[PDB]
């Protein structure tokens, strides 16, 4: 057949041209089922029509696409393995994954692509139906194809296609055959449409969503709208729909939409084909408008889905049904009026996240079960949105939130961050066709789905012409969804909102031509109308979310500040497996790939598996629909909830002093929409012990949901009162402390236990009890930890970053700090015995921190550290000010009376609630992929490790690793548990932020700049 | 200027201009256009077509211009000339005090549509007073509302020079063709001659 | 050269397909005289690195695209005739010219067009300069060639163009050798272009 053959079709080259990014491919639509039956479209009944191509095919990987031999497309490979489709084939092991941040994986040189881009041949064997070739039309969809693809069928070539998240449909009506059919699919992991594609992720090619096969009748309902119109007292809304049909156009022939709730029909109309009358030369022929009249309908909501049946039926006047389409409608609203976002006529505030279609073991290929988990832990975590980035996400995710409730933003698949400028291809009039056709096909296929609210351009593109031109179209097509668009600044004449990514609530980054403001300054601006919503904020990057109550607290203040989207929800990191067979989270450039972003792909706010980071309860606290005044003994909830009534909510309130509950009650929520409730408490004990009480309020929900189970807590709040000072006399006991004092160290006996201070060193060697021993390295000051990701920021050991907090702490010597003992001295007062001492950091010559500390052992055993501490103003400031020490103890458990129970930082503690907390040794340590200081408890008054025990107020992360061990260490399956067990006591710690991770992002008052440090500690034996 | 596209055959008018599969080579007619009449002093207004109805790729379009080029103004008639996709209000062969009611495309007075709720563009009729022959009557009656109101500035006549194609007797005497006298059908007979002058080019009366 | 064969460029027809309006087509841009000296520049002198085409080629006209010989690429043919370029091949006998209004002059189904539609076949032979392949870049620059087609130069396929109304440009640095070259144009009367095009006019190629 000459044409049909590779070399015929690859000569003109598809892949490479910007003007081809399709051929031969049918036009976009909602997903078409194509039922015979208005029942079976109505109950969501599995089509006979509709087929599944997913499973067993014969897959064989070449070099480049010239590489493959001809004979493929007769009959298939004898060298051919058989892979399931869909599928990565890059976690197949057939070809690397690579991952980068913004440099483009090849060499940026548009339109073209390295001459050597993986190629993977996909082949299926099959038998079709009779009765689907004899009437009506076959097509095949592939679902999503990454990059570019040529489809063969029976050895004639059939077309090409490309954009890797968008569904490409091609007839086969003609290229099939009675019995065996052959399917050969020449994917392309290199495509000038790559260029387009440059989102940070994890790059893999091939076929990896689903393939189908459809069949439509001869005459059929090739595309439908549903649009809802209401009232202003949204007391009464229109159905608009709109229905295309490919005919075959005839008089008799009607179509009938009719709308469903459950088993009940609300609304019918049945109307002949033809528009009215639009121009000169009249209506559409082919075209029908039927518009449903609903009385008091329900409107759609992520708080309240309320999802309504519509069956769109193409019908003979007699009647018998020549094919039957259903599909979901919510009724809503989404306006920006007077500069604000608006949800059936209230503003929402969006407590979204952004979120990666990614699966540790299957790469990019997404399954039912991780869609439903993903968007429980969601709403369970207080997420009303998600961002689907930054590309058009699986049809089935759409579907989820609908029914689920989730604010969805559906974004574009252009995203040109790797190009320079960055707005060089979205500028050009010449890559102006590829680029619509990423938009345009998109919103013809996602515009049916109520949860989707926003439309976006694309990610980082710059701003061009191009994105005007389509922000254009959408709205032209689509005024029923605000547009948005990051680029060029985000106040663009593209985007509807203003949405920075990034941007920080007070200081604003001061960049040449795209500007960073302040979210408060930002509204302020001349001219300003526009409401902001963070498309990204918070760079949820390992050890995150510091300073995250600082944006919440500014979105509930500010009106046109309706919140934004974190990022990200899940790290995208892949499984890779041992030499030993035992599996390990890889990341960046694990799998031989270089230049790579190394362990930047992981930001979520979860684990993959997917296991909970200590900071999604901080953003689960922050995003609360209950917030809480207390006012003496009355307390006071508003709910953020805009449509929906308390209807199922249970208020628990605990009286505790010490840990221990001196009062509890329950109270059942009544609170209306974006109402107030004052709630009296009975009168509270007055615990004549001295000590804190706290009263810590929780809002419960006694009845099972969809998304949650019975007894879920959705809120919860802690106050402090009643503090009673203790004016009690520790001292003294009838025994009296005993030292002896050599040349080599200090020695102190006082009964069973004997405590030992180095004179060379001037900190305390070791501890005894018994008959018995106790640590294994010597209690020292500590003023470093195990450098965040937020603390390296970008900056690595090719290219140092002089910003980083890790980069001044090296250059500053603080790790390399030497301590020098200048003054150590041991005395014995008459109760206890004391002994002073003063040590100095020195790094080249300067000093960076003197130590003075007074240990006091007290007659009954307890030693009292006080530590002073004094920080040079020319040093950058400490990460943290602390005692440090390692313990040859390891007990099984963790007692300890403070903020918990899970880590919390300075930075980021809102969410911890004060109380006496039991954990696990391996609970108190956060096992992030990427090593670094970790399970940090604040707000500790008492800490019980084995028979050790610490008062006063501090900040402890008990752990396995040490700080050393942890900085050196890349990945956390190579992390040893060293001997004993690491104690890091410190009284003041830095924050750990942060707004981004490039950058420092550490508050001023977070830091550690006093200059100047007190803090005293009780160290005592049981 | 006006870019090359008109799709006036078709039912409706905008069946290929609310295309989204025909945006790509709609778009290529214009922004080729203007890349290469940009920095000509003489144009100074741009056009997305001619009678292509309203579509959602001119209002695309539309917008595209304007933003490489705030140099210029953009009109289009398509849609009733008071669409969005049009900085000035040019409609066609409208009339100065009798107004056609037509559906959806209704065709104002030149003086009425300016008074309509809401207009604020200014109108300029991108054709106007058809020349088809004996004709210009009433001619005096536009210029007369040209000078008296500020928002009317004038328009373009239609047409300039017949289109009339030259061919030759059987004794050889050459003589004026129209419409299907190269025996061509189905076709639109003498309405391709609608110029002021002939196409020697003598001036018509 | 297999690809360089009418058979596989006719078989991926470009002149239905809407995405495809352009192939190895160069970018817009006001019109580049490319003068060497700053004078030449100034007072509008004709530069020598343009040169006109213009002149006697020779053409040869067909019934359908597919109807015109393999032979055709390597050497003219001997029935074709020598018409002046630019010009349409209507006036000059070849295949009728119609007028029509707002009606197609072919069946409206988009985007097809009729199987038959009137191509015409440009070749011409030239010497270009040696110091022109030397260093530096040609381009062929067709002002103007109504509806679509495709070029051939040295017997090797070049590219596809479309829109009648803007100059479609191919680089013609590779294809080009030293001494006589030829270059083998096959317009085509009716293209998916035509949809776009539907002005009030004589319709010629
Ligand atoms: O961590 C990835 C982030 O990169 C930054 S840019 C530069 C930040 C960067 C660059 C190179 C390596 C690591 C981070 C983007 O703005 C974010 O959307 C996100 O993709
Ligand atoms: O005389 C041509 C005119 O036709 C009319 S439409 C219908 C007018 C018409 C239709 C068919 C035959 C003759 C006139 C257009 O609006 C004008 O621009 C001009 O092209
Ligand atoms: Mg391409
Ligand atoms: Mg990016
Ligand atoms: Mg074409
Ligand atoms: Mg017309
Ligand atoms: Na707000
Ligand atoms: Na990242
Ligand atoms: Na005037
Ligand atoms: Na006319």
């Known amino acids: 057949m000459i044409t049909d053959s590779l070399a015929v079709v690859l000569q003109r080259r598809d892949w490479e041209n910007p003007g081809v990014t399709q051929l031969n491919r049918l036009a976009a639509h909602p997903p078409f089922a194509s039922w015979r039956n208005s029942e079976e479209a109505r109950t969501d009944r599995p089509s006979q029509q509709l087929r599944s191509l997913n499973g067993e095919w014969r897959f064989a990987w070449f070099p480049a696409p010239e590489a493959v031999p001809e004979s493929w497309l007769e009959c298939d490979l004898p060298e051919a393995d058989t892979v399931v489709v869909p599928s990565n084939w890059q976690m197949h092991g057939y070809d690397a994954p690579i991952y980068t941040n913004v440099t483009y994986p090849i060499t940026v040189n548009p339109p073209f692509v390295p001459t050597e881009n993986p190629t993977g041949c996909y082949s299926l064997t099959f038998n079709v139906d009779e009765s689907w070739l004899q009437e009506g039309q076959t097509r095949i969809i592939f679902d999503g194809v990454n990059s570019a693809f040529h489809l063969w069928c029976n050895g004639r070539w059939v077309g ?101 709730q459950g088993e009940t029909q609300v609304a019918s109309g049945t109307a002949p084909f033809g528009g009215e009358i639009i121009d000169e030369r009249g209506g559409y022929a082919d075209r029908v408008t039927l518009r449903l009249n609903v009385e008091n309908p329900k409107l759609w909501s992520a708080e309240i889905p309320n999802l309504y049946r519509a069956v769109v039926e193409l019908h003979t006047a007699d009647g018998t049904l020549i094919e039957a389409e259903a599909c979901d409608v919510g009724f809503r609203e989404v306006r920006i009026e007077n500069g604000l976002l608006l949800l059936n006529g209230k503003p929402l505030l969006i407590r979204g996240v952004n979120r990666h279609e990614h699966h540790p073991l299957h790469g990019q290929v997404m399954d039912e079960q991780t869609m439903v988990q993903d968007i429980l832990l969601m709403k369970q975590n207080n997420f009303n949105a998600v961002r689907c980035s930054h590309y058009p996400n699986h049809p089935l995710w759409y579907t989820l939130c609908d029914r689920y409730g989730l604010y969805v933003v559906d974004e574009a698949n252009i995203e040109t961050h790797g190009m320079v400028p960055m707005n060089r291809l979205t500028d050009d009039p010449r890559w102006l066709p590829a680029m619509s056709e990423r938009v345009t096909r998109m919103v013809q296929r996602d515009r049916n789905h109520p949860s989707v609210i926003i439309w976006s351009l694309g990610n980082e593109s710059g701003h061009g012409a191009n994105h005007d031109a389509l922000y254009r179209w959408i709205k032209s097509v689509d005024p029923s969804r605000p547009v948005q668009y990051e680029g060029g600044g985000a106040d663009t004449t593209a985007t509807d909102i203003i949405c920075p990514m990034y941007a920080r609530v007070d200081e604003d980054q001061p960049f040449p031509a795209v500007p960073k403001w302040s979210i408060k300054k930002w509204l302020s601006l001349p001219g300003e109308t526009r409401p902001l919503i963070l498309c990204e904020y918070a760079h949820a990057m390992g050890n995150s979310l510091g300073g995250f109550a600082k944006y919440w607290q500014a979105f509930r203040q500010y009106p046109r500040l309706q919140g934004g989207f974190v990022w990200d929800w899940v790290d995208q990191s892949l499984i890779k497996y041992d030499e030993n067979g035992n599996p390990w989270s890889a990341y960046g450039g694990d799998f031989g790939d270089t230049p790579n972003d190394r362990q930047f792909c992981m930001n979520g706010l979860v684990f993959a598996d997917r296991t909970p980071h200590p900071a999604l309860t901080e953003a689960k606290h922050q995003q609360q629909f209950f917030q809480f005044r207390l006012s003496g003994q009355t307390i006071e909830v508003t709910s953020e909830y805009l449509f929906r009534h308390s209807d199922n909510e249970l208020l628990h309130w605990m009286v505790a002093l010490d840990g221990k509950p001196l009062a509890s009650g329950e109270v059942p929520l009544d609170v209306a929409p974006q109402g107030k409730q004052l709630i009296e408490l009975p009168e509270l004990p007055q615990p004549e012990s001295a000590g804190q009480l706290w009263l810590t309020v929780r809002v419960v929900q006694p009845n099972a949901t969809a998304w949650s189970e019975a007894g879920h807590i959705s809120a919860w709040q802690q106050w402090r009162l009643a503090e009673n000072l203790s004016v009690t006399l520790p001292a003294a006991s ?240 190579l992390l040893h548990a060293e001997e004993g067990t690491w104690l890091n006591i410190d009284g003041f710690h830095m924050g750990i932020g942060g707004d981004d991770s490039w950058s420092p992002s550490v508050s001023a008052e977070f830091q550690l700049s006093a200059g100047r440090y007190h803090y005293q500690l009780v160290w005592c034996q049981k």
């Open 734 to 973: 009838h025994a009296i402390p005993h030292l002896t004092t050599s040349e080599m160290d200090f020695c102190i006996e006082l009964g069973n236990k004997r405590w030992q201070f180095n004179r060379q060193s001037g900190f305390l060697s070791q501890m005894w009890i018994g008959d018995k021993k106790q640590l294994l390295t010597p209690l020292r000051d500590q003023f470093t930890r195990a450098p965040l990701d937020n603390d390296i920021g970008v900056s690595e050991a090719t290219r140092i970053d002089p910003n980083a907090w890790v980069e001044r702490w090296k250059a500053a010597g603080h790790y390399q700090a030497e301590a020098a003992l200048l003054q150590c001295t041991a005395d014995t007062l008459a109760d206890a015995v004391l002994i002073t001492t003063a040590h100095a950091w020195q790094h080249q010559g300067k000093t960076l921190f003197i130590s003075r500390k007074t240990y006091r052992i007290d007659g009954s055993g307890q030693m009292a550290i006080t530590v002073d501490v004094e920080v040079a103003s020319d040093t950058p400031h400490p990460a943290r000010i602390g005692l440090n020490c390692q313990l040859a103890q390891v007990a099984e458990r963790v007692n300890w009376l403070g903020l918990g129970p899970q880590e919390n930082y300075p930075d980021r503690l809102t969410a911890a609630c004060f109380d006496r907390w039991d954990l696990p040794l391996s609970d108190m340590y956060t096992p992030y992929v990427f090593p670094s200081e970790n399970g940090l408890r604040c707000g500790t008054r008492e800490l019980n490790y084995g028979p050790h025990q610490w008062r006063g107020d501090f900040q402890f992360n008990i752990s396995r690793y040490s700080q050393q061990q942890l900085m050196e260490t890349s990945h956390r399956h």
């Open 160 to 260: 090409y296609g490309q954009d890797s998240r968008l569904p490409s449909e091609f007839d086969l009506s003609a290229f099939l055959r009675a019995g065996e059919n052959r399917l050969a699919v020449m994917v392309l992991r290199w495509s000038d449409g790559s260029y387009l594609e440059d989102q940070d992720m994890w790059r893999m090619s091939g076929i990896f969503r689903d393939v189908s096969l459809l069949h439509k009748p001869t005459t059929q309902i090739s595309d439908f709208h549903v649009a809802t119109r209401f009232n202003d007292d949204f007391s009464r809304a229109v159905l608009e729909a709109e229905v295309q049909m490919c005919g075959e156009l005839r008089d008799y022939l009607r179509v009938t939409v009719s709308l469903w």
